[PDB]
């Protein structure tokens, strides 16, 4: 037996008049304050998801509409509020600045500039919560987005309009891979968005300083929800980034959006749910945490030209728009059977698994190709890369099948010894240094060198120097071929001839 916000003076009011004299349904009064949740009494006409306006310039989102209470979460510092403050229900839902002028700015979850470079020049506002494009409005994804990593572009292609999860343990290069995927777009025509959930501000400062060393910051938006900000903002942060990315998609341009640790958005939402007393499921997560990420990631889409023409009212014709997502997840001790990883692995179109046993042994990026998947597959590759990467899957597959013998390798036969020592070389080939991305011509050239047997003589200790020398050789001598591959991605018997000649002349007349 416990009370439900029936208290002395409210009851007395009702004693004197049970049928409340008609009173504004557009306002109510705070009756409770705790941990960022306020209980409001009144607000007969409040709608779920509505924005409620508090003294000062602050807002709350109405999430629980109960029998004579509205549970709302304060978007900002709440400790100032107090029982009895009056509050009004705006008719509105949350909206965020949207425009082309956000590129290069750092903005918080409400689009307020946080870098101090002065106000924004946006292009109007967009609702943070929106429905994704329908089934009939899509178009099949058949364009590559290049990360500049041999291991990812060869064996786990990402296509414009895809949703590729990056998942691994702590400190394995999850953020590194995504920020190299961003830096590599500086001259690709894809606008990037990096939204950081629950990180400490001095990490964001550092990634922005690295994005600005390289020329990438002029072409990317940063949305920050630091670890000190209230849960409502950390939980709504990804949707503001999606609402800023959908500006480009819906106008026939391409965007790329990186949600950094959705596994922290899930935690902020768990906090909000447990403070509103909602029934906990597994690991105390609320029931609907799948519907949380699902309706977020289903906004990444490629939309056909008819949808663009309808949306821009004929102003843009003949161009498809796209939005690509790379949500990041953190698994404790490599458990992919926890509640949050179990959902996002089921929503997305692919998975990049980063492993710490590989990261320590020096294989960086630590991509694990045996368990990584891309469902779009070769449809998102340039046909030169699609042709050449097909031999790497088989090389590494036979290697994974023979790897168990590495410890008895002395007793093996020379037939399988050659496969076992080829897999090691094509594995040592996929290692790569940070912030050093490769154009598709360089990747194709190196994967060609590996597939066609050229590296068989080179000792395992020299593959890195071999590659490093080969790239400089080709750069000084054969710039006109690289300039052709990088621009067409095409593959021919003529192209194969030219490449075979390059490799012969290099391996005969150079040294590494």
């Amino acid at each position: 037996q416990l009370n439900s916000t029936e208290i002395s003076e409210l009851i007395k009011q009702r004693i004197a008049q049970f049928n409340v004299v008609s009173e504004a349904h557009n306002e109510g009064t705070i009756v409770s304050v705790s941990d960022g949740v306020i209980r409001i009494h009144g607000l007969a006409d409040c709608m779920q998801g509505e924005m409620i306006s508090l003294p000062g310039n602050r807002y709350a989102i109405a999430l629980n509409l109960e029998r004579d209470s509205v549970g709302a979460v304060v978007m900002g510092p709440y400790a100032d509020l107090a029982e009895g403050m009056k509050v009004k229900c705006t008719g509105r839902i949350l909206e965020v600045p949207v425009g082309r002028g956000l590129l290069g700015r750092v903005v918080n979850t409400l689009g307020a500039p946080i870098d101090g470079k002065g106000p924004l020049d946006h292009d109007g506002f967009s609702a943070v919560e929106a429905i994704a494009p329908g089934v009939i409005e899509r178009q099949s994804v058949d364009q590559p987005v290049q990360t500049g990593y041999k291991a990812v572009d060869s064996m786990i292609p990402i296509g414009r309009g895809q949703r590729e999860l990056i998942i691994g343990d702590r400190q394995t290069g999850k953020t590194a891979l995504a920020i190299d995927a961003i830096i590599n777009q500086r001259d690709s025509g894809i606008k990037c968005i990096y939204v950081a959930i629950g990180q400490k501000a001095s990490t964001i400062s550092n990634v922005v300083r690295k994005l600005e060393e390289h020329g990438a910051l002029a072409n990317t938006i940063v949305v920050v929800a630091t670890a000190s900000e209230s849960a409502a903002l950390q939980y709504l942060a990804p949707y503001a980034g999606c609402a800023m990315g959908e500006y480009f998609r819906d106008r026939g341009e391409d965007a790329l959006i990186i949600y950094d640790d959705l596994s922290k958005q899930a935690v902020a939402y768990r906090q909000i749910s447990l403070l509103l007393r909602r029934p906990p499921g597994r690991e105390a997560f609320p029931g609907d945490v799948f519907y949380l990420h699902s309706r977020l990631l289903e906004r990444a889409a490629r939309v056909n030209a008819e949808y663009v023409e309808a949306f821009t009212k004929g102003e843009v014709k003949g161009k498809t728009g796209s939005l690509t997502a790379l949500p990041i997840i953190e698994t404790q001790a490599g458990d992919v059977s926890a509640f949050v990883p179990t959902n996002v692995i089921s929503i997305t179109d692919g998975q990049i698994f980063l492993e710490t046993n590989l990261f320590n042994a020096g294989i960086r990026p630590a991509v694990n190709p045996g368990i990584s998947v891309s469902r779009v597959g070769g449809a998102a590759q340039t046909k030169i890369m699609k042709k050449l990467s097909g031999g790497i899957r088989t090389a590494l597959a036979q290697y994974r099948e023979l790897a168990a013998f590495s410890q008895f390798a002395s007793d093996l036969d020379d037939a399988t010894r050659k496969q076992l020592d080829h897999g090691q070389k094509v594995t040592e080939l996929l290692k790569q240094k940070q912030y050093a991305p490769m154009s598709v011509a360089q990747q194709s050239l190196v994967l060609f060198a590996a597939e066609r047997g050229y590296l068989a003589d080179v000792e395992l200790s020299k593959i890195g120097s071999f590659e490093a020398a080969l790239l400089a050789y080709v750069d000084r001598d054969h710039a006109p071929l690289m300039q052709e591959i990088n621009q067409t991605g095409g593959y021919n018997d003529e192209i194969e001839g030219k490449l075979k000649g390059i490799l012969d002349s290099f391996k005969a007349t150079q040294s590494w």
Binding site: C46, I136, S346, D413
Partner: protein, 460 residues
């Protein structure tokens, strides 16, 4: 008139209170004007006096307390019949393909009782699918159920596309595709592939997409079932494709957690084994017609033992397990011949010919597994003259199980091949008898029928 009023809204769960004369029944459908739009709610529980707890079949945002709610005095009911062929519909039977109204004569409620054990009939007519490995290693009869088990990226969805294409083109049978928790990218690729292959006019589609609330994703299996039942009453033999049972069970778990039921074994609802039976028990062949079913089932983290795949096993008649290792060596359909199984694979039903061919193939592959690890150490020349023969024939058999699909042409440009069961048995039985010991291995790779291996050997 509209007799009810909303009294709570908490996420997707809405409480509505009616006068106690006219409380809706369970599973009834209500209707409310969510702004400039219409929203239907499905009653889950009659709790307390006049109050009813419901699940919203749509976005809950914009709902106020006190809105007027009207009860449609019948469950959710969807269009059925020939009118639905070639259309895409959501859980409520509304078209999501922009081709306009459905044109249906008749509407059926999606909640109905399964056939009684005496209305059934057991007939052992094998389906012919046109895929070598499936027809040979995992035969399944009309009215039975097949489960495509495997991890992610192995081929469940393109295997189902291929089965649909074959059934629709080579046997002119109708089909229904229920996309329980469907990724819109794959749903659109499926729509364009069915319409390009010119089979759309014999499939009817139902999509509960991932971005929809749990209630939509849960009830879609029953809408697909109801359409397949309408086709059965007409005396047809239909085929029902469920795109993932795993997401049916997940939608059930979410719906359970929202209604506050006390959870169970690993966070799954308590009613898991009852929901699975409510679904799987309406799929049967009755004396008037037949529903066959093939069902993709994701196994999370390769363990086959957590409740979601563990419970479904009780209902399947055949299981085809797909492996990413096999797929990575490039031999699609990526079916493992040793672990796939069928209850119909016994001589009394498939004849001694098919049975002996199947067991002989499994035995040769099982022996090649043994010899692999001697070949690795001792090298191959230490094998007998007979064992080198088992090796060459096992490698040929292992190539021959691969096949080029008509729907995979978009991935590789290669044209598809349909292989009858006679050709399958004849080809494998020939290979195992040394009839083709003179051809090279690669002559059998992605070659379709056996007579096309001899053609390909001339060109190699």
């Amino acid at each position: 008139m509209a007799t009810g009023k909303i009294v709570q809204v908490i996420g997707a769960v809405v409480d509505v209170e009616f006068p106690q004369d006219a409380v809706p029944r369970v599973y009834d459908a209500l209707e409310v004007q969510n702004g400039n739009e219409r929203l239907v709610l499905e009653v889950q529980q009659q709790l307390g006096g006049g109050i009813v707890r419901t699940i919203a079949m749509g976005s809950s945002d914009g709902l106020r307390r006190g809105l007027d709610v009207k009860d449609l005095e019948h469950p959710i009911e969807v269009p059925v019949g020939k009118a639905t062929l070639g259309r895409i519909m959501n859980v409520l039977g509304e078209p999501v393909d922009m081709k306009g109204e459905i044109g249906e004569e008749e509407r059926w409620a999606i909640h109905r009782a399964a056939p009684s054990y005496e209305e059934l009939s057991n007939s052992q007519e094998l389906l012919e699918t046109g895929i070598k490995v499936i027809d040979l290693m995992a035969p399944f009869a009309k009215g039975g159920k097949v489960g495509l088990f495997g991890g992610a990226g192995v081929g469940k969805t393109v295997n189902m596309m291929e089965l649909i294409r074959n059934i629709a083109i080579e046997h002119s049978g109708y089909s229904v595709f229920a996309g329980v928790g469907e990724r819109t990218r794959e749903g659109n690729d499926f729509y364009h592939e069915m319409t390009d292959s010119n089979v759309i006019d014999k499939v009817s589609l139902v999509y509960g997409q991932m971005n929809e609330p749990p209630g939509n994703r849960l009830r879609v299996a029953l809408t697909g079932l109801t359409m397949a039942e309408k086709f059965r009453d007409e005396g047809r033999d239909v085929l029902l494709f469920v795109d993932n049972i795993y997401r049916y069970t997940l939608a059930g778990t979410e719906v359970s957690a929202l209604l506050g039921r006390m959870p169970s074994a690993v966070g799954y609802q308590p009613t898991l084994a009852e929901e699975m039976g409510v679904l799987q028990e309406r799929i049967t062949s009755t004396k008037t017609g037949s529903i066959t079913s093939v069902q993709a089932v994701y196994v999370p983290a390769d363990d086959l033992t957590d409740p979601s795949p563990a419970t479904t096993f009780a209902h399947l008649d055949a299981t085809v397990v797909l492996s990413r290792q096999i797929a990575s060596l490039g031999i699609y359909p990526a079916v493992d011949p040793l672990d796939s199984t069928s209850r119909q694979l016994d001589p009394l039903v498939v004849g001694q010919e098919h049975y002996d061919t199947a067991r002989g193939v499994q035995s040769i592959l099982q022996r090649y597994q043994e010899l692999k690890d001697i070949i690795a150490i001792l090298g191959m020349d230490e094998l007998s003259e007979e064992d080198k023969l088992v090796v060459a024939r096992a490698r040929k058999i292992q190539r021959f199980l691969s096949q080029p699909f008509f729907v995979a042409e978009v991935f590789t440009g290669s044209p598809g091949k349909y292989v009858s069961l006679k050709d399958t048995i004849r080809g494998f039985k020939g290979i195992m008898e040394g009839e083709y010991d003179h051809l090279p291995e690669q002559a059998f790779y992605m070659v379709g029928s056996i007579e096309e291996a001899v053609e390909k050997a001339k060109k190699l």
